[PDB]
Amino acid sequence: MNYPAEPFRIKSVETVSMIPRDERLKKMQEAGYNTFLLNSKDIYIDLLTDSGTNAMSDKQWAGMMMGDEAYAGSENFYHLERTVQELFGFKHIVPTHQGRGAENLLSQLAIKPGQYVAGNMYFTTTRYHQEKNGAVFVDIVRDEAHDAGLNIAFKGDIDLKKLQKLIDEKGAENIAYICLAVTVNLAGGQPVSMANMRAVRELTAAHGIKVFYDATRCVENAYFIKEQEQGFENKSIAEIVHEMFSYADGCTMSGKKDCLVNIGGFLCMNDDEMFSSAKELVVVYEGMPSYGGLAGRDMEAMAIGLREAMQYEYIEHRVKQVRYLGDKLKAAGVPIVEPVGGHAVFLDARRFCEHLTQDEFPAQSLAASIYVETGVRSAERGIISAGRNNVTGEHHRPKLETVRLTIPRRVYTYAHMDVVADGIIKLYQHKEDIRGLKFIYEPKQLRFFTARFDYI
Amino acid sequence: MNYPAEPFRIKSVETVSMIPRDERLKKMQEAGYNTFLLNSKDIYIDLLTDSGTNAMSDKQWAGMMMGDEAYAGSENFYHLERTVQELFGFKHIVPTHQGRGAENLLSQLAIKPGQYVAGNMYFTTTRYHQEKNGAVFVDIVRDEAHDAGLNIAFKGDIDLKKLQKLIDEKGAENIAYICLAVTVNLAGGQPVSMANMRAVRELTAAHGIKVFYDATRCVENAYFIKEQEQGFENKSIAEIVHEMFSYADGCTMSGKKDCLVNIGGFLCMNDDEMFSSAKELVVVYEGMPSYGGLAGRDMEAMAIGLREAMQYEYIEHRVKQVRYLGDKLKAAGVPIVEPVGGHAVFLDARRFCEHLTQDEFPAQSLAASIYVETGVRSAERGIISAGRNNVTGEHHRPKLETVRLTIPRRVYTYAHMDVVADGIIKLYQHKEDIRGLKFIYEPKQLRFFTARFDYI
Amino acid sequence: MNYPAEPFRIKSVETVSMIPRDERLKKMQEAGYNTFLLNSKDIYIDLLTDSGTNAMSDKQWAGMMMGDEAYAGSENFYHLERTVQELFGFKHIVPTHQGRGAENLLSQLAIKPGQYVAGNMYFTTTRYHQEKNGAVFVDIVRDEAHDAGLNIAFKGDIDLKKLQKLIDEKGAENIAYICLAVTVNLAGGQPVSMANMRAVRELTAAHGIKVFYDATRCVENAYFIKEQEQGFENKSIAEIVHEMFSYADGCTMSGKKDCLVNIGGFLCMNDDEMFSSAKELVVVYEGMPSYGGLAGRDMEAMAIGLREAMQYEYIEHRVKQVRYLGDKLKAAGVPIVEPVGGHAVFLDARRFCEHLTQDEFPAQSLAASIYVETGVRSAERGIISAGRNNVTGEHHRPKLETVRLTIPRRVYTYAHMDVVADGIIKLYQHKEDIRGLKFIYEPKQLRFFTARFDYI
Amino acid sequence: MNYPAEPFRIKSVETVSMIPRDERLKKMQEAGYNTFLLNSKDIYIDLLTDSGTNAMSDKQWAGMMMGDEAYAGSENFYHLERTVQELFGFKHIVPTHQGRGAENLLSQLAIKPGQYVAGNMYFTTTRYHQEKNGAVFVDIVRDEAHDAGLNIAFKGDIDLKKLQKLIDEKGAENIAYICLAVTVNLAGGQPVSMANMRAVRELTAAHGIKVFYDATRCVENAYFIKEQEQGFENKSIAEIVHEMFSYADGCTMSGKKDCLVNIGGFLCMNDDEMFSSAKELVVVYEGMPSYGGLAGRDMEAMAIGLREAMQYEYIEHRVKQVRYLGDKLKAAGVPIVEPVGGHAVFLDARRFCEHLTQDEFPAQSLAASIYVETGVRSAERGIISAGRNNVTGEHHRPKLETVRLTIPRRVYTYAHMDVVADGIIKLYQHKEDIRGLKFIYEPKQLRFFTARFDYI
Numbered sequence A, B, C, D: 001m002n003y004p005a006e007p008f009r010i011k012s013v014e015t016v017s018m019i020p021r022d023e024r025l026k027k028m029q030e031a032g033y034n035t036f037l038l039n040s041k042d043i044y045i046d047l048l049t050d051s052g053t054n055a056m057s058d059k060q061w062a063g064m065m066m067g068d069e070a071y072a073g074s075e076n077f078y079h080l081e082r083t084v085q086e087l088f089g090f091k092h093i094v095p096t097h098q099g100r101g102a103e104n105l106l107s108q109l110a111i112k113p114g115q116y117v118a119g120n121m122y123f124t125t126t127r128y129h130q131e132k133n134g135a136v137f138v139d140i141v142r143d144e145a146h147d148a149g150l151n152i153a154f155k156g157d158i159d160l161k162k163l164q165k166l167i168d169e170k171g172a173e174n175i176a177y178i179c180l181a182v183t184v185n186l187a188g189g190q191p192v193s194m195a196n197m198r199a200v201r202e203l204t205a206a207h208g209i210k211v212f213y214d215a216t217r218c219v220e221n222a223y224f225i226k227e228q229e230q231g232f233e234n235k236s237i238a239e240i241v242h243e244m245f246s247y248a249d250g251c252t253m254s255g256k257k258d259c260l261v262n263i264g265g266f267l268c269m270n271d272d273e274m275f276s277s278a279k280e281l282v283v284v285y286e287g288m289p290s291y292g293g294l295a296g297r298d299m300e301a302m303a304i305g306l307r308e309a310m311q312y313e314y315i316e317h318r319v320k321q322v323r324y325l326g327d328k329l330k331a332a333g334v335p336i337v338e339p340v341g342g343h344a345v346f347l348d349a350r351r352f353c354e355h356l357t358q359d360e361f362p363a364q365s366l367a368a369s370i371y372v373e374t375g376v377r378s379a380e381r382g383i384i385s386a387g388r389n390n391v392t393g394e395h396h397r398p399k400l401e402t403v404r405l406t407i408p409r410r411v412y413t414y415a416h417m418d419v420v421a422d423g424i425i426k427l428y429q430h431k432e433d434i435r436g437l438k439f440i441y442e443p444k445q446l447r448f449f450t451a452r453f454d455y456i
Ligand SMILES: CSCC/C(=[NH+]\C=C1\C(COP(=O)(O)O)=CNC(C)=C1[O-])C(=O)O
Pocket: B048, B049, B050, B051, B098, B099, B100, B101, B123, B124, B125, B126, B181, B185, B214, B216, B217, B253, B254, B255, B256, B265
């Protein structure tokens, strides 16, 4: 089916208030037209992020009643360890409270100042931890990933020529590791093919270079391989996931994404010495090697959720629900990043509001308009989030000026997607009426989080 | 909007699954062709009943952690008592484990042998408890309620002329009480108007006759009043519910329906002497006046759920989701009871299976065939449910021979409704293949729950 | 050990509080001097009953998250059925919402008017359901069970000479069944020996008489057999339980006692025809044969809890905690029933209040005074609970006039027992101050639950 | 009363079990003679730590069902913020996943390399984060705190003469801050007086020096003030807590101790600029300022638990239960730190094992022997925990060489305390059998968590 029915039914609901437009207008004004400042209690459909916002199952909630809260050696850790060893195939696992805790550990362990880390684009926290430990980041994604309207498969793949070039100019010993993300968030949630993972593994192995995956959306990635990569159409999601990680030396994982939980993460590796070093550091920042900054019940929920994520029908519906939203927007002529990724639809606010300049913050204003008209919260991912250059005093000015519609797993229905699409499309039909915004309060940094605006 | 989105988010899920047709065939035969004897694990979408199958909210589950399990005087009872007094306006409440526990109490307290109980169409458990305590049941619903295809508003209303005739012929002193159900389950979930409730109060009061409501689906009923009865368009659900019960002397309630719970019921009354007598009897069959055969946590969940049911957007969506299923079926030519009711779509098995007579149990057989071909469980609501005449020994022969696609509250989506509709539409194309059934095992009362059949 | 430490630790708590004596004095008067009418919030330590007040385990709470709420054929029902078949050995099980629901079914199914039901001491609800269906109750417990100060083992045993005499004088065909309770609640929680169960099985089987066990405290009973009956010292609790029920034709069970739950019960039987008849009747009063007036989650919790109860260390501690309280009271000279039983310490109110006659309700008044002086709630188990003779209308006058300090399972500690003992010992020092009581409101049956009194 | 009963009842339980001594010996060897490396399932009574091992209440578990998992603006964050502002009085709060996450933030924000941080005794994670960010730690606790057997009140107080000397010798501008811990963990859980907090505030304020409290066991501290500091006898715990923090510029908190939770912490500060800088840094390591590496449900549970901790009867019982264990050990001749602290009994391994030198790690070996002989897990708090001197490379050599019997809140009973005491008393009778240890694996920091040893 183009759009399958949910492969689950509802066990329990999160109630919502359903406040009307006049009241949403006041809330948006009180939030200074910044959706990051809205109160959760005032939001009907919250698409700010797919991170930690997922609905758990009955089996996960049963596990939440079985937390072994011991400081060391919790049975829940051994359940998580066994599950990750089975499904990802790595020899060793260290729990962390979420993904950036694992990134902190990996970058401290595997980078020397001056070295390079090359990846298929970057994620904000991952690159910060690389750079804070002295690495220079090099983007080795295929050029195609940067073209928003290019509707091609496996747009997240690494350009092997860029990787060969880096090796030739800088030298293998000066490359700390390759950071291969699945899927690639900044490209719109675009997958990487098994062929590319295998090819990257072959080239790096010939030079002794390590490859660590950013595995946060690896199950969405596996679905794209099953659906679209020749030869994988009849492999199980689990078989695909296991093969993907066979081409890596380790990974960082945010369980808050594809492990179907509200908190949790981990670091995996095959190397024994790196495992020992990682355990010496986890106690500094997170907790013991057997809890990593998580309650026992959360290790249990993450173990159960990662296994639930292997169900084909679950991940097919997850990805096709996102696709449903993107397809409805595209059919109405709304410009989006293509093809639709695994976890989100991205609106091109620059083209949505061509009557405004980027200095008038069209993505921020479009996000405000979306909430007023529908009760849906979306994330600004444009000039505001890019920040300001404190040296020159001017904005960093991003290539992509977007509004991100990020879909939590198992929370919403197709009818909710219709609410989102209908409101965005109605606005698009009168896009000229969307007003530009100006700062009335701007902090020196983290400005997306607390900045306040008014209409021009 | 014809079909609004869910006015809630999913908080937790439960997986669904389908087994092959050949296995479904074997299971239906093992169940003696009675869907009530099928196992839950073998059902894909379970529409047997809206009773006790509802999804609770986060607030209800929080209450489930606050059970005061004391044998007497639980705080959860006082919460339930205060909530029901506020929302229904009755002086006194006695909890019961579900609705038929309240019916047992009412029928023992209020019936002397030989008296008449008059109601707007029978219900199975209700009529049995009336008859077993010596009453003769008299149907005083309007004739239109028995005409499946007649689309008129408030089909559940009592015909005041039938009520007056009963009074004239039998004498008011020989009427135990009037049983006024809202909505009327077996007419198709058909509502009763506020005008009719007021008229019934006025007429019975003039003779000193008591009126006890069956409140099991009273919130669905209040929605129809708000949607369709002149002068109520702007009144709140809670205001409508409170006025409804101001025309009654008490009620029986299965909380398992409109109180959004999985277990629970209660008996309400205004009269002090009847309350004292009800308390003397609740301890025989159920438990204390302050637990009534329920865990404390379940009184808490029922208190919270009844209040949640008062939210307009919740009940509007509940009813319109059922309407969506019926609309799709009717447009494809599948015969149904009209208008669609509050809790279920009722297939008209007489028209679906015109090649069978009612003595060949077309609704029972249709329910079986639906399961074999689709994995969807539905309920017989026809000659089998109607039972035997307790005087003549022949079958009761209701004009309505129907199969009920019964929708649990807050469990399924519109996509699930589409799956159900598509499968029934396909069965309809070969309706002539549905075979007649005959009894092989017939219980002595309430036979539909466990009877077994074989094909003719 | 005499008093082992708890074989569990605390997973979660509920706060308790003492209120001032002047407030307890007013509350006791407002409750008509009946502890059953006090509110839970006003009780410091609530020893009214061990029924439904137990603390569940983490594993049971995990099961509570796995409720299959289907109206028919829930997986939780099948888990309960498999568990009871394995542990008790009966062919068939019908769930009920609690014990008296099972008693209603058994008494309606198995009693013809005028027949005799013989049991090892009456119980309140049990006797009412026997008499309501037309039986004469005959006490066949050994005479010793009625003597509070007689410290002998297996005081609950049936006197075979009394059973033989009933058979000889009345005829076996006029005996509906034998009710064999394990333990015997109102004798003080006194166990029945395996030898006695065997002897009763042999005599009844020879005459075609059925024996239905009251299984409500069967695990406590098994502990006494393991501890004290020659030849069972090395048998497991589970082995003992399974052998006990091999001597029975079925059982009634309030799961609210030894199944470690807050709600639940069942009726078991080996006879297929009685099973069919019981299923035809359960739908009238309780629910389907596959839910019986319980939520699916509650069938799950009861299945888990009954298995947990088989753990030796759990039941040893359970019984020895009760013994600790009784030993401390006896050592201070407070008169109690001996030996101490499995679930409660029974104060001998005839001796505690020697200055009152039984017609002045000394047990009822002692329970009131305990609450006033200590904040501890306890239960009358004497003339009030015994009820009125259903032939003469005079009080039944049990030799045992007692107040029951009933201990919920896994709820309280030895320190709480010390508080209870200390308070009762202090009251004993001025026992002459306890005033006699008289009825001001008397229910027509089961009067102890809600009767109100005033001081003479 | 010396030893009050628990001011709560048990709501739910978790089983406990013991493996036999021969198996414990093998497990201890496999764990390299480090109790931190034992598995939870192999422990009978787990007194490794009071961190994150607490039993939550029914009200907290209700909150766990009300998690608002939104990435920003969660109701649970606002509840936590409001609660901490009310109870502690600080202007701003940043959540962290646990205490060392807050320490990471404070140390990075408030320390210029080379500056001094002065505290009332070191703590392991705290000192590591101070030193990693370039500070020199200076102990300014009163000398008596290092004297295990000296029973004096408020042993945790700062010696103002030592603080004045640091100011005079080093200059106020070279002191990053004072770290004032309540209670002082490694001194034995010893409290700080309000008078001392006031005097420290006055002296630091006169020199412009900031004071940040370690609030982890502040409620235990407040109890000691109420019980023993003149003038506080009739002040509530909450009033005491609020006054305590009025003398601070901010705090770090591990909620896993006195906030009665299994995960969670926070950083508070009054300074607006530090708050802005902390929000910029929390995103790097923990998460948004709106969740700080915690699920919404955990912010909710922490807010509820901190408020519950203010109940006098709860904290009185908490501290007196620890005192019960210490009193029993002391009376039997077992050497302990005196007076007993708020959260643990500290055995004095220097006196327990006088046949060993500190260089043979007597505390580490005593903890191993305790587990082997009793199944009780305890923590080394001596030379191993003290770590290496980061200037000389030699062991730090604390005067206090102790083993900590750390009591989780609301988990164990006095009967469990008796078991612990009896086993340690028995081991003391053959104390000469405890063998010295040597490192076989030493982590580079926080070595006590994962080091491995062998017998000399
Ligand atoms: C499968 S027939 C049993 C369940 C069921 N209805 C129950 C009702 C009861 C009895 O209430 P309860 O089941 O004892 O709580 C009383 N009045 C009405 C109007 C009812 O609809 C249904 O599927 O429609």
